[PDB]
Amino acid sequence: FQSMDTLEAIRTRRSVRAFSDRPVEPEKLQMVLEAARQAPSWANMQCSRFVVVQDAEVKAKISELSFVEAFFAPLGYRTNPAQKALAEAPVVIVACGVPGESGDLRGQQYYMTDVGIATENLMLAAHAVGLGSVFVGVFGEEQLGDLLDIPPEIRIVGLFPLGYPRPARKPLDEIVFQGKWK
Amino acid sequence: SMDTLEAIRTRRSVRAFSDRPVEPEKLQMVLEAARQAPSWANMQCSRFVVVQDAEVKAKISELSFVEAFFAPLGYRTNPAQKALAEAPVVIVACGVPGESGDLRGQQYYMTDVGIATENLMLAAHAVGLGSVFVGVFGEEQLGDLLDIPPEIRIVGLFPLGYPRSGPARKPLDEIVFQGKW
Ligand SMILES: Cc1cc2nc3c(=O)[nH]c(=O)nc-3n(C[C@H](O)[C@H](O)[C@H](O)COP(=O)(O)O)c2cc1C
Ligand SMILES: Cc1cc2nc3c(=O)[nH]c(=O)nc-3n(C[C@H](O)[C@H](O)[C@H](O)COP(=O)(O)O)c2cc1C
């Protein structure tokens, strides 16, 4: 399939924060999630998990949870410029990690690295088929988990607005959940 | 190079390398790909030491052995150990933890290096090269060997070779170091 040259995709990929309301073809959504699934992971343990969120009301709640209060502003983000994107995008993908399914040594959380690898696949694949996304790291984790029925032992790592800009792997259905955690 | 989806699908962990030299141009494309990675607040905490010296690469290989007592998840032995010695190039990927998010007790520098090294690995595969993420190594001795300060964290080793409108990035000469830190 002809998407985009790898070097070109890597160079031209941008954080997209403004989305049209044009629907994402499930065929493209599948190519994006397949790319994430194809990611290398610590010992092929594949600790990444994804919740695909499409409901308007639920997306609006997620957007609210990604607000930055100046008092609690994390490093480098005085505001969260991707906040409205989480509301506007037809699809929001919530990327999580099972920490016990990746390396834990030298005080380092390799699940964070594994999810980074998988989400860079996800973002490059999306850009390659004409979609846009942005890694969102700022959000209230406990409220988000509560909203999506994500168990507290699962760690949420990033949110990915997805839409049109304005050695065997586990089955897709084992690492991607529709609407809420299963 | 190669179609993005195809490269993502066909990329493999390569652990056996030929002795064909890596063309300077390809090495640069691979490092530039890592430089182009997105990162927490564009702070770009990733750093890279490019090692080519035969003896230093042997030492790195010597350092990526698994001690039974410290055997991490799924790696009773390190299958990529010989690769570190064989490969024409080893890229040592590091992170500056203070230059990425640290909240909810999560080390986002690990995520940022993960992102940059997936660019590196995809780019490498796209131009006909092979690589493998090596997470198993003795960080202290490796840091000493390569003059890497202990406040800098080493995240991954990358044998590299042949198989047998966004915000400004930091310049390449500030994140890529030749031979040693
Ligand atoms: C964070 C990370 C660390 C890794 N460390 C090692 C390692 O120390 N030794 C090794 O042989 N492979 C290592 N790998 C490679 C995995 O074993 C490999 O990616 C996985 O089994 C999937 O196979 P594939 O890359 O060919 O698709 C590592 C991979 C990741 C993502
Ligand atoms: C780990 C991580 C967390 C991020 N969190 C946010 C975020 O919360 N809000 C936002 O607008 N962008 C976020 N970004 C996007 C970066 O700000 C962006 O990648 C960087 O500024 C470079 O821009 P570019 O992606 O267009 O090259 C995040 C990126 C990374 C890698």
Side-chain angles (χ1 to χ4, degrees), chain A residues 1 3-6 9-11 13-14 42-43 75 77 106-113 120-121 137 139 155-157 169, chain B residues 1-4 7-8 11 36 40-41 73 75 100 104-108 110-111 115 118-119 135 137 153-155 166 169:
Chain A
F1 183 73
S3 56
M4 187 180 296
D5 178 76
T6 298
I10 291 175
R11 177 187 28 105
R13 178 224 48 85
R14 298 272 66 87
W42 189 281
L75 172 72
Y77 291 104
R106 305 182 297 254
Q108 295 168 303
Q109 305 159 354
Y110 276 87
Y111 83 89
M112 297 293 291
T113 299
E120 181 61 354
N121 272 12
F139 51 83
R155 300 307 306 277
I156 308 173
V157 178
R169 298 291 194 280
Chain B
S1 53
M2 179 184 305
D3 181 77
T4 301
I8 286 165
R11 179 218 50 78
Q36 290 157 351
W40 189 278
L73 177 65
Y75 297 112
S100 196
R104 306 179 298 253
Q106 296 168 297
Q107 299 152 11
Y108 275 87
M110 298 288 293
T111 294
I115 290 169
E118 183 58 353
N119 275 7
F137 53 82
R153 302 302 310 266
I154 304 170
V155 177
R169 296 294 195 273

Short mmCIF file of all heavy atoms in Angstrom, two decimals, chain A residues 1 3-6 9-11 13-14 42-43 75 77 106-113 120-121 137 139 155-157 169, chain B residues 1-4 7-8 11 36 40-41 73 75 100 104-108 110-111 115 118-119 135 137 153-155 166 169:
data_model
loop_
_atom_site.label_atom_id
_atom_site.label_comp_id
_atom_site.label_asym_id
_atom_site.label_seq_id
_atom_site.Cartn_x
_atom_site.Cartn_y
_atom_site.Cartn_z
N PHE A 1 0.82 -1.21 0.00
CA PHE A 1 0.00 0.00 0.00
C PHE A 1 0.86 1.26 0.00
O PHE A 1 1.89 1.32 0.67
CB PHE A 1 -0.95 0.02 1.21
CG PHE A 1 -1.89 1.20 1.23
CD1 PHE A 1 -2.97 1.27 0.35
CD2 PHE A 1 -1.71 2.24 2.13
CE1 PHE A 1 -3.84 2.36 0.37
CE2 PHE A 1 -2.58 3.33 2.16
CZ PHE A 1 -3.65 3.39 1.27
N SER A 3 1.33 4.85 1.22
CA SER A 3 0.93 5.85 2.21
C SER A 3 1.83 7.06 2.05
O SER A 3 1.47 8.07 1.42
CB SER A 3 1.03 5.27 3.64
OG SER A 3 2.34 4.78 3.94
N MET A 4 3.03 6.93 2.59
CA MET A 4 4.00 7.99 2.52
C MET A 4 5.35 7.38 2.80
O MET A 4 5.45 6.43 3.57
CB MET A 4 3.68 9.06 3.57
CG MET A 4 4.53 10.31 3.46
SD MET A 4 4.05 11.62 4.85
CE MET A 4 2.20 12.01 4.28
N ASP A 5 6.38 7.90 2.15
CA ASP A 5 7.74 7.49 2.42
C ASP A 5 8.09 7.67 3.91
O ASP A 5 7.73 8.68 4.54
CB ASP A 5 8.68 8.30 1.52
CG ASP A 5 10.13 7.98 1.77
OD1 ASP A 5 10.59 6.91 1.31
OD2 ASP A 5 10.82 8.82 2.40
N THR A 6 8.78 6.68 4.48
CA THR A 6 9.12 6.68 5.91
C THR A 6 9.89 7.92 6.35
O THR A 6 9.50 8.58 7.32
CB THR A 6 9.93 5.42 6.32
OG1 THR A 6 9.15 4.25 6.08
CG2 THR A 6 10.29 5.48 7.81
N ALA A 9 7.52 10.92 6.16
CA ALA A 9 6.56 10.87 7.27
C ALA A 9 7.18 11.32 8.58
O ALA A 9 6.60 12.10 9.34
CB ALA A 9 5.98 9.45 7.43
N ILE A 10 8.38 10.81 8.87
CA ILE A 10 9.05 11.14 10.12
C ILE A 10 9.39 12.63 10.18
O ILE A 10 9.21 13.27 11.21
CB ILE A 10 10.33 10.33 10.29
CG1 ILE A 10 9.98 8.85 10.53
CG2 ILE A 10 11.17 10.89 11.45
CD1 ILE A 10 11.20 7.91 10.59
N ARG A 11 9.86 13.18 9.07
CA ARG A 11 10.20 14.60 9.03
C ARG A 11 8.97 15.51 9.09
O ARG A 11 9.02 16.59 9.68
CB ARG A 11 11.05 14.92 7.79
CG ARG A 11 11.40 16.40 7.63
CD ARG A 11 12.09 16.70 6.29
NE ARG A 11 11.71 15.76 5.23
CZ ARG A 11 10.88 16.05 4.23
NH1 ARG A 11 10.34 17.26 4.14
NH2 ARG A 11 10.61 15.13 3.31
N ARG A 13 5.72 14.78 10.15
CA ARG A 13 4.74 14.56 11.22
C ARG A 13 4.72 15.77 12.15
O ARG A 13 5.77 16.26 12.56
CB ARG A 13 5.10 13.28 12.00
CG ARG A 13 4.16 12.97 13.17
CD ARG A 13 4.95 12.54 14.42
NE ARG A 13 6.06 13.47 14.66
CZ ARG A 13 5.96 14.61 15.34
NH1 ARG A 13 4.81 14.99 15.88
NH2 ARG A 13 7.03 15.38 15.49
N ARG A 14 3.52 16.25 12.47
CA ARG A 14 3.33 17.38 13.39
C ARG A 14 2.35 17.02 14.47
O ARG A 14 1.52 16.13 14.29
CB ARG A 14 2.78 18.59 12.63
CG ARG A 14 3.68 19.13 11.54
CD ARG A 14 4.65 20.17 12.11
NE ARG A 14 5.60 19.59 13.07
CZ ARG A 14 6.76 19.06 12.71
NH1 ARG A 14 7.12 19.01 11.42
NH2 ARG A 14 7.57 18.55 13.63
N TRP A 42 9.47 -4.66 25.08
CA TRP A 42 10.32 -5.42 25.98
C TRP A 42 9.97 -6.91 25.95
O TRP A 42 8.90 -7.31 26.39
CB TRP A 42 10.18 -4.88 27.41
CG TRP A 42 11.19 -5.48 28.34
CD1 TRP A 42 11.14 -6.71 28.93
CD2 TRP A 42 12.41 -4.87 28.79
NE1 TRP A 42 12.26 -6.91 29.71
CE2 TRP A 42 13.05 -5.79 29.63
CE3 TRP A 42 13.02 -3.64 28.54
CZ2 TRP A 42 14.28 -5.53 30.24
CZ3 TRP A 42 14.24 -3.37 29.15
CH2 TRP A 42 14.85 -4.31 29.98
N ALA A 43 10.90 -7.71 25.42
CA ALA A 43 10.73 -9.15 25.29
C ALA A 43 9.44 -9.58 24.59
O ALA A 43 8.89 -10.64 24.88
CB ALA A 43 10.84 -9.83 26.65
N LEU A 75 5.75 20.79 34.23
CA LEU A 75 6.89 21.22 33.44
C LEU A 75 6.52 21.49 31.98
O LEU A 75 5.99 20.62 31.30
CB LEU A 75 7.95 20.13 33.47
CG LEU A 75 9.13 20.35 32.54
CD1 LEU A 75 10.02 21.47 33.07
CD2 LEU A 75 9.91 19.07 32.40
N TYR A 77 4.20 23.00 30.40
CA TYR A 77 2.82 23.22 29.93
C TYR A 77 2.03 24.13 30.87
O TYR A 77 1.35 23.65 31.78
CB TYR A 77 2.06 21.91 29.70
CG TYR A 77 2.59 21.12 28.53
CD1 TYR A 77 3.38 20.00 28.73
CD2 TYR A 77 2.31 21.50 27.22
CE1 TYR A 77 3.87 19.27 27.66
CE2 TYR A 77 2.81 20.78 26.14
CZ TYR A 77 3.59 19.66 26.38
OH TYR A 77 4.12 18.95 25.33
N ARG A 106 17.14 -0.92 37.26
CA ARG A 106 17.90 0.33 37.39
C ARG A 106 16.99 1.50 37.76
O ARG A 106 17.29 2.66 37.46
CB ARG A 106 18.68 0.64 36.09
CG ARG A 106 19.61 -0.47 35.61
CD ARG A 106 20.38 -0.07 34.33
NE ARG A 106 19.47 0.16 33.22
CZ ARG A 106 19.30 -0.65 32.19
NH1 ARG A 106 19.99 -1.77 32.08
NH2 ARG A 106 18.41 -0.34 31.26
N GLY A 107 15.87 1.19 38.42
CA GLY A 107 14.87 2.18 38.77
C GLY A 107 14.13 2.75 37.55
O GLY A 107 13.51 3.80 37.64
N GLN A 108 14.21 2.06 36.42
CA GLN A 108 13.61 2.59 35.19
C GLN A 108 12.33 1.86 34.77
O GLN A 108 12.28 0.63 34.75
CB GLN A 108 14.61 2.57 34.03
CG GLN A 108 15.79 3.48 34.22
CD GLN A 108 16.87 3.20 33.20
OE1 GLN A 108 17.36 2.08 33.11
NE2 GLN A 108 17.23 4.22 32.42
N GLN A 109 11.32 2.64 34.42
CA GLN A 109 10.02 2.13 34.03
C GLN A 109 9.96 1.89 32.53
O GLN A 109 9.55 2.78 31.78
CB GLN A 109 8.95 3.15 34.43
CG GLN A 109 8.96 3.57 35.92
CD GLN A 109 8.27 4.92 36.19
OE1 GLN A 109 7.85 5.61 35.26
NE2 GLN A 109 8.16 5.28 37.46
N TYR A 110 10.37 0.71 32.06
CA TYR A 110 10.40 0.47 30.62
C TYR A 110 9.02 0.41 29.97
O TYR A 110 8.92 0.51 28.76
CB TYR A 110 11.29 -0.72 30.22
CG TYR A 110 12.74 -0.31 30.10
CD1 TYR A 110 13.58 -0.32 31.21
CD2 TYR A 110 13.26 0.14 28.88
CE1 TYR A 110 14.91 0.09 31.11
CE2 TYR A 110 14.59 0.54 28.77
CZ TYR A 110 15.41 0.52 29.89
OH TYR A 110 16.73 0.94 29.80
N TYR A 111 7.95 0.26 30.76
CA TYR A 111 6.61 0.35 30.16
C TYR A 111 6.40 1.73 29.49
O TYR A 111 5.75 1.82 28.45
CB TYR A 111 5.50 0.00 31.17
CG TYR A 111 5.05 1.12 32.09
CD1 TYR A 111 4.02 1.98 31.71
CD2 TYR A 111 5.63 1.31 33.33
CE1 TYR A 111 3.59 3.01 32.53
CE2 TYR A 111 5.20 2.34 34.18
CZ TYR A 111 4.18 3.19 33.75
OH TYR A 111 3.73 4.21 34.54
N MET A 112 6.98 2.78 30.08
CA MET A 112 6.92 4.13 29.50
C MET A 112 7.56 4.20 28.12
O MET A 112 7.04 4.85 27.20
CB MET A 112 7.61 5.13 30.43
CG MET A 112 6.95 5.25 31.79
SD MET A 112 5.14 6.07 31.67
CE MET A 112 5.66 7.91 31.15
N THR A 113 8.70 3.54 27.98
CA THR A 113 9.42 3.42 26.72
C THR A 113 8.65 2.60 25.69
O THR A 113 8.53 3.00 24.53
CB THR A 113 10.78 2.74 26.95
OG1 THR A 113 11.57 3.55 27.84
CG2 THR A 113 11.52 2.53 25.63
N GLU A 120 4.57 6.16 18.84
CA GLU A 120 5.24 6.80 17.70
C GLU A 120 4.87 6.07 16.41
O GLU A 120 4.61 6.71 15.39
CB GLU A 120 6.76 6.94 17.88
CG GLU A 120 7.51 7.64 16.71
CD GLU A 120 7.07 9.09 16.44
OE1 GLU A 120 6.11 9.56 17.07
OE2 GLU A 120 7.71 9.79 15.60
N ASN A 121 4.78 4.74 16.46
CA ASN A 121 4.21 3.99 15.34
C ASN A 121 2.82 4.51 14.99
O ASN A 121 2.50 4.71 13.83
CB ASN A 121 4.09 2.50 15.67
CG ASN A 121 5.35 1.74 15.34
OD1 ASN A 121 6.39 2.32 15.06
ND2 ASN A 121 5.25 0.43 15.35
N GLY A 137 0.07 14.37 27.24
CA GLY A 137 0.55 13.76 28.48
C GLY A 137 -0.06 14.35 29.74
O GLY A 137 0.13 13.81 30.84
N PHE A 139 -3.23 15.29 31.95
CA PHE A 139 -4.62 14.91 32.20
C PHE A 139 -4.71 14.40 33.63
O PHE A 139 -3.70 13.98 34.20
CB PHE A 139 -5.11 13.81 31.22
CG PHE A 139 -4.19 12.63 31.13
CD1 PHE A 139 -4.26 11.61 32.07
CD2 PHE A 139 -3.21 12.56 30.14
CE1 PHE A 139 -3.38 10.54 32.02
CE2 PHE A 139 -2.35 11.48 30.07
CZ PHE A 139 -2.42 10.48 31.01
N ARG A 155 -1.63 1.86 34.03
CA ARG A 155 -1.19 3.26 34.03
C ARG A 155 -1.50 3.92 32.70
O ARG A 155 -1.15 3.38 31.64
CB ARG A 155 0.30 3.37 34.34
CG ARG A 155 0.69 2.79 35.70
CD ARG A 155 -0.17 3.37 36.85
NE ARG A 155 -0.15 4.84 36.89
CZ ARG A 155 0.80 5.56 37.48
NH1 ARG A 155 1.83 4.96 38.05
NH2 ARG A 155 0.75 6.90 37.47
N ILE A 156 -2.17 5.06 32.75
CA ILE A 156 -2.45 5.84 31.55
C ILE A 156 -1.25 6.72 31.20
O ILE A 156 -0.70 7.40 32.07
CB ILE A 156 -3.71 6.71 31.71
CG1 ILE A 156 -4.87 5.84 32.19
CG2 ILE A 156 -4.10 7.35 30.38
CD1 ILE A 156 -6.12 6.64 32.55
N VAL A 157 -0.84 6.68 29.95
CA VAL A 157 0.40 7.33 29.54
C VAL A 157 0.15 8.50 28.61
O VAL A 157 0.79 9.55 28.75
CB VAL A 157 1.37 6.31 28.87
CG1 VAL A 157 2.66 7.00 28.39
CG2 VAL A 157 1.70 5.18 29.83
N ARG A 169 2.41 -11.28 17.53
CA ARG A 169 1.82 -10.25 18.37
C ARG A 169 0.45 -10.72 18.89
O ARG A 169 -0.26 -11.47 18.21
CB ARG A 169 1.66 -8.95 17.57
CG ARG A 169 2.98 -8.33 17.07
CD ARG A 169 3.81 -7.79 18.23
NE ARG A 169 4.90 -6.91 17.79
CZ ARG A 169 6.07 -7.35 17.31
NH1 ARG A 169 6.29 -8.65 17.21
NH2 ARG A 169 7.01 -6.48 16.94
N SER B 1 13.17 5.83 0.36
CA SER B 1 13.43 4.78 1.35
C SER B 1 12.43 3.61 1.26
O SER B 1 12.67 2.61 0.57
CB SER B 1 13.48 5.37 2.77
OG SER B 1 12.33 6.15 3.08
N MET B 2 11.32 3.72 1.98
CA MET B 2 10.33 2.64 2.04
C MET B 2 9.04 3.20 2.60
O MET B 2 9.07 4.04 3.50
CB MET B 2 10.84 1.51 2.93
CG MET B 2 9.87 0.33 3.09
SD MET B 2 10.49 -1.07 4.36
CE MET B 2 12.25 -1.45 3.57
N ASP B 3 7.91 2.72 2.09
CA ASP B 3 6.60 3.10 2.61
C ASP B 3 6.49 2.97 4.14
O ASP B 3 6.92 1.97 4.72
CB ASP B 3 5.51 2.26 1.94
CG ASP B 3 4.12 2.63 2.42
OD1 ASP B 3 3.61 3.67 1.98
OD2 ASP B 3 3.55 1.88 3.24
N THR B 4 5.91 3.99 4.77
CA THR B 4 5.80 4.04 6.24
C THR B 4 5.11 2.81 6.85
O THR B 4 5.65 2.20 7.76
CB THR B 4 5.07 5.31 6.71
OG1 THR B 4 5.78 6.47 6.24
CG2 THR B 4 4.94 5.35 8.25
N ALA B 7 7.28 -0.32 6.34
CA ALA B 7 8.44 -0.30 7.22
C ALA B 7 8.04 -0.64 8.66
O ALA B 7 8.76 -1.35 9.36
CB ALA B 7 9.14 1.05 7.16
N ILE B 8 6.89 -0.13 9.10
CA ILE B 8 6.43 -0.40 10.45
C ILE B 8 6.11 -1.89 10.57
O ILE B 8 6.42 -2.54 11.57
CB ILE B 8 5.21 0.49 10.83
CG1 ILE B 8 5.67 1.92 11.10
CG2 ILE B 8 4.50 -0.05 12.09
CD1 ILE B 8 4.53 2.95 11.13
N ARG B 11 9.76 -4.06 9.87
CA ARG B 11 10.87 -3.86 10.82
C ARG B 11 11.03 -5.09 11.75
O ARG B 11 10.05 -5.57 12.31
CB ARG B 11 10.63 -2.61 11.68
CG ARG B 11 11.73 -2.31 12.71
CD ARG B 11 11.14 -1.77 14.03
NE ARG B 11 10.06 -2.63 14.49
CZ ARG B 11 10.23 -3.80 15.11
NH1 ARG B 11 11.46 -4.24 15.38
NH2 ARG B 11 9.18 -4.53 15.47
N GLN B 36 14.07 14.44 14.82
CA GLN B 36 12.75 14.93 14.44
C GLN B 36 11.62 14.44 15.37
O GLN B 36 10.47 14.83 15.19
CB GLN B 36 12.44 14.55 12.99
CG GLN B 36 13.27 15.32 11.98
CD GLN B 36 13.39 14.59 10.63
OE1 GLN B 36 12.97 13.44 10.48
NE2 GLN B 36 13.95 15.27 9.64
N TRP B 40 8.07 15.71 25.04
CA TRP B 40 7.43 16.53 26.07
C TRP B 40 7.82 17.99 25.97
O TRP B 40 8.99 18.34 26.20
CB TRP B 40 7.82 16.01 27.46
CG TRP B 40 7.02 16.66 28.57
CD1 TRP B 40 7.25 17.88 29.15
CD2 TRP B 40 5.88 16.11 29.24
NE1 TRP B 40 6.31 18.13 30.11
CE2 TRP B 40 5.46 17.06 30.19
CE3 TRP B 40 5.17 14.91 29.12
CZ2 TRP B 40 4.36 16.85 31.02
CZ3 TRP B 40 4.07 14.70 29.94
CH2 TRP B 40 3.68 15.67 30.89
N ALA B 41 6.84 18.84 25.66
CA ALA B 41 7.05 20.29 25.55
C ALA B 41 8.18 20.67 24.59
O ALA B 41 8.77 21.74 24.71
CB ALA B 41 7.27 20.91 26.93
N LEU B 73 12.71 -9.18 33.18
CA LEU B 73 11.57 -9.85 32.56
C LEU B 73 11.89 -10.37 31.16
O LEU B 73 12.33 -9.61 30.30
CB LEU B 73 10.39 -8.87 32.48
CG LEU B 73 9.14 -9.42 31.77
CD1 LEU B 73 8.55 -10.58 32.55
CD2 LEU B 73 8.10 -8.32 31.51
N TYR B 75 14.27 -11.90 29.79
CA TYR B 75 15.65 -12.04 29.32
C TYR B 75 16.56 -12.76 30.32
O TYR B 75 17.32 -12.12 31.05
CB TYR B 75 16.26 -10.68 28.93
CG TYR B 75 15.56 -9.99 27.77
CD1 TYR B 75 14.83 -8.82 27.98
CD2 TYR B 75 15.64 -10.50 26.48
CE1 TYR B 75 14.20 -8.17 26.92
CE2 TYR B 75 14.99 -9.86 25.42
CZ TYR B 75 14.27 -8.69 25.65
OH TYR B 75 13.61 -8.05 24.63
N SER B 100 12.07 16.29 30.74
CA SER B 100 10.79 15.70 30.33
C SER B 100 9.87 15.67 31.55
O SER B 100 10.31 15.88 32.68
CB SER B 100 10.99 14.29 29.76
OG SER B 100 9.85 13.84 29.04
N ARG B 104 2.66 12.17 38.26
CA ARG B 104 1.97 10.92 38.56
C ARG B 104 2.99 9.82 38.81
O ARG B 104 2.69 8.64 38.67
CB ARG B 104 1.01 10.54 37.42
CG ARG B 104 0.03 11.64 37.06
CD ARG B 104 -0.88 11.22 35.91
NE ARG B 104 -0.12 10.97 34.71
CZ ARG B 104 -0.09 11.77 33.65
NH1 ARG B 104 -0.83 12.87 33.61
NH2 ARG B 104 0.67 11.43 32.63
N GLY B 105 4.21 10.21 39.20
CA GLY B 105 5.30 9.27 39.39
C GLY B 105 5.79 8.61 38.09
O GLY B 105 6.48 7.60 38.13
N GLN B 106 5.45 9.18 36.95
CA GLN B 106 5.88 8.59 35.67
C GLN B 106 7.06 9.34 35.06
O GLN B 106 7.07 10.57 35.05
CB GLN B 106 4.72 8.52 34.68
CG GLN B 106 3.59 7.62 35.12
CD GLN B 106 2.33 7.80 34.26
OE1 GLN B 106 1.74 8.88 34.23
NE2 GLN B 106 1.94 6.75 33.58
N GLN B 107 8.04 8.59 34.59
CA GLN B 107 9.27 9.13 34.01
C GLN B 107 9.06 9.32 32.51
O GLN B 107 9.29 8.39 31.74
CB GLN B 107 10.41 8.12 34.21
CG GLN B 107 10.74 7.78 35.69
CD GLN B 107 11.33 6.37 35.88
OE1 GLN B 107 11.68 5.68 34.91
NE2 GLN B 107 11.41 5.93 37.14
N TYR B 108 8.60 10.49 32.09
CA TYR B 108 8.33 10.68 30.67
C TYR B 108 9.58 10.71 29.79
O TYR B 108 9.47 10.54 28.58
CB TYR B 108 7.39 11.88 30.40
CG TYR B 108 5.94 11.48 30.54
CD1 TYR B 108 5.31 11.52 31.79
CD2 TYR B 108 5.22 11.02 29.45
CE1 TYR B 108 3.99 11.14 31.93
CE2 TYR B 108 3.89 10.63 29.58
CZ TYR B 108 3.28 10.70 30.83
OH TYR B 108 1.96 10.31 30.99
N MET B 110 11.65 8.43 29.59
CA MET B 110 11.66 7.06 29.05
C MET B 110 10.76 6.97 27.82
O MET B 110 11.05 6.28 26.85
CB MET B 110 11.15 6.09 30.11
CG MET B 110 12.03 6.05 31.38
SD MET B 110 13.72 5.12 30.96
CE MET B 110 13.00 3.31 30.64
N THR B 111 9.63 7.66 27.89
CA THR B 111 8.71 7.72 26.77
C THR B 111 9.33 8.51 25.61
O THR B 111 9.28 8.06 24.47
CB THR B 111 7.37 8.33 27.20
OG1 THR B 111 6.75 7.43 28.13
CG2 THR B 111 6.45 8.52 25.99
N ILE B 115 10.20 7.11 21.92
CA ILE B 115 9.70 7.73 20.70
C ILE B 115 10.84 7.98 19.71
O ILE B 115 10.73 7.63 18.54
CB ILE B 115 8.98 9.05 21.01
CG1 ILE B 115 7.66 8.79 21.74
CG2 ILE B 115 8.73 9.89 19.73
CD1 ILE B 115 7.05 10.08 22.28
N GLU B 118 12.29 4.76 18.27
CA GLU B 118 11.45 4.12 17.26
C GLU B 118 11.60 4.83 15.92
O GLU B 118 11.62 4.17 14.88
CB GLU B 118 9.98 3.99 17.70
CG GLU B 118 9.04 3.26 16.70
CD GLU B 118 9.47 1.82 16.34
OE1 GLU B 118 10.56 1.39 16.74
OE2 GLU B 118 8.70 1.11 15.66
N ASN B 119 11.76 6.15 15.93
CA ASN B 119 12.12 6.87 14.70
C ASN B 119 13.43 6.32 14.13
O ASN B 119 13.53 6.00 12.94
CB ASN B 119 12.26 8.38 14.95
CG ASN B 119 10.93 9.11 14.86
OD1 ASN B 119 9.87 8.50 14.74
ND2 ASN B 119 10.97 10.44 14.94
N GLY B 135 17.97 -3.28 25.95
CA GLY B 135 17.70 -2.67 27.24
C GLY B 135 18.52 -3.25 28.37
O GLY B 135 18.53 -2.71 29.48
N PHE B 137 22.00 -4.06 30.11
CA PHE B 137 23.39 -3.59 30.14
C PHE B 137 23.74 -3.07 31.54
O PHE B 137 22.86 -2.68 32.31
CB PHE B 137 23.62 -2.48 29.10
CG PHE B 137 22.65 -1.34 29.20
CD1 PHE B 137 22.84 -0.32 30.12
CD2 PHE B 137 21.53 -1.29 28.37
CE1 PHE B 137 21.93 0.74 30.22
CE2 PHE B 137 20.62 -0.24 28.46
CZ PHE B 137 20.82 0.78 29.39
N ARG B 153 20.82 9.41 32.17
CA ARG B 153 20.42 8.01 32.23
C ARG B 153 20.55 7.34 30.86
O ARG B 153 20.12 7.91 29.85
CB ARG B 153 18.99 7.87 32.76
CG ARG B 153 18.75 8.49 34.13
CD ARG B 153 19.68 7.87 35.20
NE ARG B 153 19.67 6.41 35.19
CZ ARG B 153 18.88 5.65 35.96
NH1 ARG B 153 18.03 6.21 36.81
NH2 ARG B 153 18.95 4.32 35.87
N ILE B 154 21.15 6.16 30.83
CA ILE B 154 21.24 5.38 29.60
C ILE B 154 19.99 4.50 29.48
O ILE B 154 19.61 3.83 30.43
CB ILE B 154 22.52 4.50 29.58
CG1 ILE B 154 23.76 5.36 29.80
CG2 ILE B 154 22.63 3.73 28.28
CD1 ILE B 154 25.02 4.57 30.03
N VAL B 155 19.37 4.50 28.31
CA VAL B 155 18.10 3.83 28.13
C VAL B 155 18.17 2.63 27.18
O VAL B 155 17.52 1.61 27.41
CB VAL B 155 17.04 4.83 27.62
CG1 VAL B 155 15.71 4.13 27.36
CG2 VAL B 155 16.87 5.97 28.63
N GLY B 166 6.53 22.81 12.53
CA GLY B 166 6.70 22.51 13.95
C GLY B 166 7.74 23.37 14.64
O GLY B 166 8.53 24.04 13.98
N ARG B 169 13.90 22.28 16.63
CA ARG B 169 14.58 21.24 17.39
C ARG B 169 15.98 21.72 17.77
O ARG B 169 16.48 22.68 17.19
CB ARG B 169 14.70 19.96 16.54
CG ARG B 169 13.36 19.30 16.18
CD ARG B 169 12.65 18.78 17.42
NE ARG B 169 11.57 17.85 17.07
CZ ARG B 169 10.33 18.22 16.80
NH1 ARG B 169 9.98 19.51 16.84
NH2 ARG B 169 9.42 17.29 16.48
#
